[PDB]
Amino acid sequence: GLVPRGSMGFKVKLEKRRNAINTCLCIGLDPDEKDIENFMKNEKENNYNNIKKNLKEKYINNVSIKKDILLKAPDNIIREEKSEEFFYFFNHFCFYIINETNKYALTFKMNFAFYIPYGSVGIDVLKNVFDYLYELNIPTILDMKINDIGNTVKNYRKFIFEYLKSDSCTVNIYMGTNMLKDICYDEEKNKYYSAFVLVKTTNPDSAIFQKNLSLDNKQAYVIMAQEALNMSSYLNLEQNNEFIGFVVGANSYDEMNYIRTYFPNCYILSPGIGAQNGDLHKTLTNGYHKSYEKILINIGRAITKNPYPQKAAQMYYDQINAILKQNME
Amino acid sequence: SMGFKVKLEKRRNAINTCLCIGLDPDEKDIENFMKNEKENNYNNIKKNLKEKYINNVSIKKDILLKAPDNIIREEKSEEFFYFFNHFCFYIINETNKYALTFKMNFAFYIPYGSVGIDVLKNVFDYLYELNIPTILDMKINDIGNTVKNYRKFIFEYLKSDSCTVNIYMGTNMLKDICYDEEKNKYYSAFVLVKTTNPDSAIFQKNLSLDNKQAYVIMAQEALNMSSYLNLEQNNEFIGFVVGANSYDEMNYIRTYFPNCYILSPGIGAQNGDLHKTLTNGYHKSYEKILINIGRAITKNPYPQKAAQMYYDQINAILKQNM
Numbered sequence: 001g002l003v004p005r006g007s008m009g010f011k012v013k014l015e016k017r018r019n020a021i022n023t024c025l026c027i028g029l030d031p032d033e034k035d036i037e038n039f040m041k042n043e044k045e046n047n048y049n050n051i052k053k054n055l056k057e058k059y060i061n062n063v064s065i066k067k068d069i070l071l072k073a074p075d076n077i078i079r080e081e082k083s084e085e086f087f088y089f090f091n092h093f094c095f096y097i098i099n100e101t102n103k104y105a106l107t108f109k110m111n112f113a114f115y116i117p118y119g120s121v122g123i124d125v126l127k128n129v130f131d132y133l134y135e136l137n138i139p140t141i142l143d144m145k146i147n148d149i150g151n152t153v154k155n156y157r158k159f160i161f162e163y164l165k166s167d168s169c170t171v172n173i174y175m176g177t178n179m180l181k182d183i184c185y186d187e188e189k190n191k192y193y194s195a196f197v198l199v200k201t202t203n204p205d206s207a208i209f210q211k212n213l214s215l216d217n218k219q220a221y222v223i224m225a226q227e228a229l230n231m232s233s234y235l236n237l238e239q240n241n242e243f244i245g246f247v248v249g250a251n252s253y254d255e256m257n258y259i260r261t262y263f264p265n266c267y268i269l270s271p272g273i274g275a276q277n278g279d280l281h282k283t284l285t286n287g288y289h290k291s292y293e294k295i296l297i298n299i300g301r302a303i304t305k306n307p308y309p310q311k312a313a314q315m316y317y318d319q320i321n322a323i324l325k326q327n328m329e
Numbered sequence: 330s331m332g333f334k335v336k337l338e339k340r341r342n343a344i345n346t347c348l349c350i351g352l353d354p355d356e357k358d359i360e361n362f363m364k365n366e367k368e369n370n371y372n373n374i375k376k377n378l379k380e381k382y383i384n385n386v387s388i389k390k391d392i393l394l395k396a397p398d399n400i401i402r403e404e405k406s407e408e409f410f411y412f413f414n415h416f417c418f419y420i421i422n423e424t425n426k427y428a429l430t431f432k433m434n435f436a437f438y439i440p441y442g443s444v445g446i447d448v449l450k451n452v453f454d455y456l457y458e459l460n461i462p463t464i465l466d467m468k469i470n471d472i473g474n475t476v477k478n479y480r481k482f483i484f485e486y487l488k489s490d491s492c493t494v495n496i497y498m499g500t501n502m503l504k505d506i507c508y509d510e511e512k513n514k515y516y517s518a519f520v521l522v523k524t525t526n527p528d529s530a531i532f533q534k535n536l537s538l539d540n541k542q543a544y545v546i547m548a549q550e551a552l553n554m555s556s557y558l559n560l561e562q563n564n565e566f567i568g569f570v571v572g573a574n575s576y577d578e579m580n581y582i583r584t585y586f587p588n589c590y591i592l593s594p595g596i597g598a599q600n601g602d603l604h605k606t607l608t609n610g611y612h613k614s615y616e617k618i619l620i621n622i623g624r625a626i627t628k629n630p631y632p633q634k635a636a637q638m639y640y641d642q643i644n645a646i647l648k649q650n651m
């Protein structure tokens with residue numbers, strides 16, 4: 001009755017991890033330029049103690065890109081490999097955050113926009129980040145909020161699900177729900193994949209379209225949720241241990257309550273705690289499911305911009321679990 | 330320096346068209362170019378290597394300048410990079426004289442990992458040296474702090490003139506895409522209004538507010554943001570993506586937003602009707618109606634002739650409209 005890692009659908013992988021670790025913390029890894037620079041400065045000042053720790057981990061030997069560089073001595077990089085210095089410290093920052101926080105994480109979410117602004121270099125880092133997480137067997141989301149016509153979105157499907165080997169991604173279906181057939185399904189290989197569609201977002205004017213637009217007396221966010229679920233049904237995702245879930249922001253308490261009430265077994269991804277000031281008690285109570293992999297609480301900057309990310313992650317893990325315990329009593 | 334609004338007007342005066350050429354190479358296009366080049370003594374690569382502005386690309390120029398016979402023997406790990414970049418250069422060299430603008434969809438450049446992002450960079454470098462206005466098609470959407478990374482990639486790293494944006498998440502994202510407060514810089518974007526996909530009516534038409542369909546609400550909110558940001562005073566604008574196949578919407582948008590910039594994909598591969606699209610979306614400053622053609626040019630085995638014919642027919646239709 002045993003399945004090897006990589007050989008099961010996201011639904012099963014998430015359920016096993018939640019059973020093991022007893023949380024719904026999703027740790028966001030969105031490293032900005034200041035983060036990377038700060039890491040390099042701190043490492044330079046302390047003889048690279050965190051990099052030396054990364055270098056001890058076995059799975060670092062199993063990453064795809066420029067392992068020759070990543071495994072070098074840090075002082076060798078700086079003196080002899082100056083054109084690789086940014087690559088090195090960028091990739092070592094992510095490995096550091098992952099090494100420090102992974103024991104608390106149901107899943108990691110990496111937002112693509114943080115890995116693209118330097119050109120090809122960050123995309124090598126991103127690939128290595130997905131390879132590393134694959135080796136540790138931690139569930140992954142690529143947050144890229146993709147949208148386009150079907151012929152074009154197949155390319156993202158290939159990047160996200162074949163090249164990165166991500167378990168899931170985020171998608172904006174405003175263009176049309178039919179794009180999902182080219183994202184959550186590969187007709188050539190007969191493979192199924194999971195995604196979270198945008199339902200209610202955390203930006204301060206999210207209401208302008210998601211709530212102001214309606215059809216009869218349902219607001220756009222409700223219609224969009226229903227359409228996404230209808231597509232999941234058509235594609236038979238849940239039969240292949242995959243799903244289409246919902247992004248619902250951690251500050252949209254009324255919408256969270258509605259979505260959970262009206263779609264009782266939906267998978268919800270909820271960003272907005274920490275940096276965006278969302279209310280964790282309210283969000284987690286309104287989105288609660290007894291299978292709490294169905295209510296992922298994403299925390300990015302509040303962990304990654306803390307000088308002690310392991311302790312910041314532990315604190316959120318403990319705070320989530322305390323609220324989970326109340327909901328379970 | 331000058332501003333996209335001024336860039337477009339001035340290129341329009343020089344070349345007299347509103348053709349926007351879509352550069353979206355898929356794996357099979359790249360493989361076919363490599364197969365054909367081999368069989369025809371690399372005649373197109375050798376033509377590429379004759380061009381002036383190849384000596385100005387940012388990334389691995391050394392490699393791109395090598396003879397293809399030598400790449401395949403001594404730089405084999407660079408073979409895909411080499412042929413991908415040369416395919417893009419070949420299309421640009423063959424078609425640029427007909428193009429008001431080039432639009433590169435990001436999705437085609439990402440799925441092999443970093444290698445295609447180096448190609449994309451060199452593509453934008455090459456177009457920049459040719460002073461051709463550019464659009465990065467990425468249909469971006471996120472919260473403000475995140476989308477700033479896209480502003481940097483698109484407008485600082487690629488030095489693109491504009492991009493496509495989906496504002497369904499909210500309109501305030503545009504303050505961190507089209508404006509850089511720190512640097513006092515302003516940039517142009519086209520927002521999705523009516524898309525070409527078959528089921529585009531589901532949210533864009535069947536949702537409404539007041540007695541206006543969603544697509545109208547969206548266009549108006551985008552123009553309000555343009556005003557807020559003072560883009561037009563900085564020679565930049567927020568324009569609209571309106572499907573070539575959406576004649577009523579095009580009609581509505583041109584009538585009710587008389588001086589708006591429209592980018593219209595969906596002719597060729599997606600079957601739209603050039604004559605109706607151009608008539609319905611027409612403006613005498615025809616840079617305000619960009620007709621995008623990607624696959625109908627790039628998947629044509631005679632891409633120079635294909636661009637020429639769209640140019641010619643666009644011009645005959647523009648002449649008819651006066």
Ligand SMILES: *c1cc(=O)[nH]c(=O)n1[C@@H]1O[C@H](COP(=O)(O)O)[C@@H](O)[C@H]1O
Nearest residue numbers: 111201202271275276299300301471475
């Ligand atoms: C996406 C959608 C949304 O509605 N809100 C969001 O914040 N996001 C993305 O989630 C992440 C939040 O991280 P942080 O505020 O905890 O740092 C970030 O990737 C954003 O793009």
Ligand SMILES: *c1cc(=O)[nH]c(=O)n1[C@@H]1O[C@H](COP(=O)(O)O)[C@@H](O)[C@H]1O
Nearest residue numbers: 148152351434524525594598622623624
């Ligand atoms: C974006 C939005 C839209 O509504 N329709 C679209 O087709 N697109 C993009 O535009 C290009 C169309 O190219 P082609 O059909 O002429 O090849 C493509 O980049 C698609 O992503």
